[PDB]
Scaffold this active site. Structure first.
Site, PDB file in Angstrom:
ATOM      1  N   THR A  69      33.664  72.045  52.566  1.00 59.64           N
ATOM      2  CA  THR A  69      33.942  72.392  53.954  1.00 59.64           C
ATOM      3  C   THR A  69      34.827  73.629  53.991  1.00 59.64           C
ATOM      4  O   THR A  69      35.915  73.607  53.403  1.00 59.64           O
ATOM      5  CB  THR A  69      34.663  71.237  54.635  1.00 59.64           C
ATOM      6  OG1 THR A  69      33.781  70.109  54.703  1.00 59.64           O
ATOM      7  CG2 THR A  69      35.101  71.612  56.037  1.00 59.64           C
ATOM      8  N   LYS A  88      39.654  66.245  52.194  1.00 61.85           N
ATOM      9  CA  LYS A  88      39.917  66.625  53.579  1.00 61.85           C
ATOM     10  C   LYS A  88      40.203  65.344  54.365  1.00 61.85           C
ATOM     11  O   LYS A  88      39.900  64.247  53.887  1.00 61.85           O
ATOM     12  CB  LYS A  88      38.722  67.381  54.186  1.00 61.85           C
ATOM     13  CG  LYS A  88      37.420  66.605  54.136  1.00 61.85           C
ATOM     14  CD  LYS A  88      36.280  67.430  54.679  1.00 61.85           C
ATOM     15  CE  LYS A  88      34.953  66.702  54.529  1.00 61.85           C
ATOM     16  NZ  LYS A  88      33.883  67.451  55.268  1.00 61.85           N
ATOM     17  N   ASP A 142      35.977  67.644  47.492  1.00 65.79           N
ATOM     18  CA  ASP A 142      35.723  67.534  48.930  1.00 65.79           C
ATOM     19  C   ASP A 142      36.898  66.869  49.646  1.00 65.79           C
ATOM     20  O   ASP A 142      36.710  66.101  50.594  1.00 65.79           O
ATOM     21  CB  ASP A 142      34.408  66.789  49.195  1.00 65.79           C
ATOM     22  CG  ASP A 142      33.803  67.083  50.565  1.00 65.79           C
ATOM     23  OD1 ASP A 142      34.117  68.127  51.177  1.00 65.79           O
ATOM     24  OD2 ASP A 142      32.983  66.250  51.022  1.00 65.79           O
ATOM     25  N   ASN A 178      37.760  62.500  54.637  1.00 64.94           N
ATOM     26  CA  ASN A 178      37.458  61.745  53.425  1.00 64.94           C
ATOM     27  C   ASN A 178      38.637  60.904  52.935  1.00 64.94           C
ATOM     28  O   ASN A 178      38.669  60.506  51.765  1.00 64.94           O
ATOM     29  CB  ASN A 178      36.934  62.674  52.330  1.00 64.94           C
ATOM     30  CG  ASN A 178      35.533  63.156  52.617  1.00 64.94           C
ATOM     31  OD1 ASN A 178      34.812  62.535  53.398  1.00 64.94           O
ATOM     32  ND2 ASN A 178      35.127  64.253  51.986  1.00 64.94           N
ATOM     33  N   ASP A 223      34.059  59.368  49.549  1.00 64.42           N
ATOM     34  CA  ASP A 223      33.099  60.474  49.551  1.00 64.42           C
ATOM     35  C   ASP A 223      33.104  61.315  48.276  1.00 64.42           C
ATOM     36  O   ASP A 223      33.573  62.457  48.261  1.00 64.42           O
ATOM     37  CB  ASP A 223      33.210  61.317  50.825  1.00 64.42           C
ATOM     38  CG  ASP A 223      32.157  60.950  51.852  1.00 64.42           C
ATOM     39  OD1 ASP A 223      30.955  61.060  51.532  1.00 64.42           O
ATOM     40  OD2 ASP A 223      32.522  60.534  52.973  1.00 64.42           O
TER      41      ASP A 223
HETATM   42  O1  LIG Z   1      30.958  58.362  46.906  1.00 56.71           O
HETATM   43  C1  LIG Z   1      31.302  57.826  48.079  1.00 56.71           C
HETATM   44  C2  LIG Z   1      30.603  58.259  49.194  1.00 56.71           C
HETATM   45  C3  LIG Z   1      30.917  57.764  50.435  1.00 56.71           C
HETATM   46  C4  LIG Z   1      31.920  56.839  50.577  1.00 56.71           C
HETATM   47  C5  LIG Z   1      32.182  56.378  51.870  1.00 56.71           C
HETATM   48  C6  LIG Z   1      32.855  55.030  51.905  1.00 56.71           C
HETATM   49  C7  LIG Z   1      33.207  54.470  53.128  1.00 56.71           C
HETATM   50  C8  LIG Z   1      33.733  53.201  53.006  1.00 56.71           C
HETATM   51  C9  LIG Z   1      34.153  52.493  54.098  1.00 56.71           C
HETATM   52  O2  LIG Z   1      34.652  51.255  53.896  1.00 56.71           O
HETATM   53  C10 LIG Z   1      34.067  53.065  55.363  1.00 56.71           C
HETATM   54  C11 LIG Z   1      33.542  54.350  55.504  1.00 56.71           C
HETATM   55  O3  LIG Z   1      33.472  54.866  56.769  1.00 56.71           O
HETATM   56  C12 LIG Z   1      33.107  55.074  54.386  1.00 56.71           C
HETATM   57  C13 LIG Z   1      32.633  56.393  49.464  1.00 56.71           C
HETATM   58  C14 LIG Z   1      32.329  56.891  48.195  1.00 56.71           C
END
Ligand SMILES: Oc1ccc(/C=C/c2cc(O)cc(O)c2)cc1
Length: 276
Positions: A179, A140, A138, A143, A160
């Site tokens: 996406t 992008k 994912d 992320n 993410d």
């Molecule tokens: O597996 C995962 C899924 C989602 C995320 C998101 C993390 C994140 C951390 C921050 O400090 C700020 C933010 O806006 C997002 C990280 C790992």
């Protein structure tokens, strides 16, 4: 695998909301015992076996398992996991400079130096992940988070991991799909997927960093997906006239339909546009 079932509010105080998506919301938080700050990602659980709302336990546990493995300056770190009847709550490292996506909206186009400064960090993070046989699936600008957006060379972390998979057999065959603007042809065609799919996404990101334009974006999702599969992109002179041929070469060797002919992460780090 079960997670901490004490009330998260007994241990953390939440603050500003950082973002939200289809099945999750991220809120800034502060741990009561240390005063240290984190991002709390609340992921909605599935409430029945056959439902389509929420995230399945299997998918949550896979994301947590991957996050528990990783520790690298360019990847987010997981601190703790809580859960209750409605949510799994990931307590994640706080990265407060916002999305690379929102940063690019400001500048609207980067120099090759500014682009390679970001890209080198992304490549270092992906090299770490691919070394562990972890495909992110994912990648992008939404992320990639900046630690501090008010410095000349912002430091980034990949976030993410909700689509990430361990690739222990060289490929996974699962209908993983992200996406449209960023997915590789093998994702569009529902073919077996490996680390190569992330390298395509890096090529798309690089094109965007250098031009401010998306290489495969159509007027609808189906058009975008059809363009990806056909490798329908070109370097528009209006955007790329003063971009070096070596930068275009880097992109061209990533936006390759056959995954076996695409540059690997190791190839990308040795490519003459990148290699010091
Ligand atoms: O597996 C995962 C899924 C989602 C995320 C998101 C993390 C994140 C951390 C921050 O400090 C700020 C933010 O806006 C997002 C990280 C790992």
């Amino acid at each position: 695998t079960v997670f901490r079932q004490e009330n998260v509010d007994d241990y953390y105080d939440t603050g500003e909301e950082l973002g939200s998506g289809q099945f999750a919301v991220v809120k800034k938080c502060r741990e009561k015992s240390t005063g240290l700050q984190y991002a709390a990602k609340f992921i909605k659980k599935r409430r029945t076996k056959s439902s389509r709302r929420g995230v399945s336990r299997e998918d949550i546990e896979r994301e947590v398992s991957i996050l528990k493995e990783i520790q690298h300056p360019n990847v987010i770190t997981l601190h703790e996991v809580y859960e209750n009847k409605t949510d799994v709550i990931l307590i994640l490292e706080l990265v407060a400079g916002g999305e690379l996506f929102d940063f690019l909206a400001e500048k609207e186009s980067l120099t090759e130096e500014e682009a390679t400064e970001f890209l080198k960090q992304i490549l270092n993070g992906v090299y770490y992940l691919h070394s562990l046989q972890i495909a992110h699936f994912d990648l992008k600008p939404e992320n990639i988070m900046l630690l501090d957006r008010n410095v000349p060379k912002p430091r980034i972390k990949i976030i993410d991991f909700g689509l990430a998979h361990k690739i222990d057999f060289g490929n996974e065959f699962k209908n993983i799909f992200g996406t449209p603007e960023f997915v590789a042809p093998e994702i569009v065609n529902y073919e077996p997927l490996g680390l190569e799919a992330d390298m395509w996404s890096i090529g798309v990101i690089t094109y965007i960093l250098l031009s401010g334009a998306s290489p495969f974006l159509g007027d609808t999702k189906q058009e975008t997906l059809a363009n990806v599969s056909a490798v329908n992109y070109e370097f528009e002179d209006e955007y790329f006239s003063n971009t070096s041929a070596l930068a275009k070469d880097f992109i061209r060797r990533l936006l390759v339909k056959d995954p076996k002919k695409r540059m690997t992460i190791q190839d990308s780090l040795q490519h003459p546009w990148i290699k010091p």
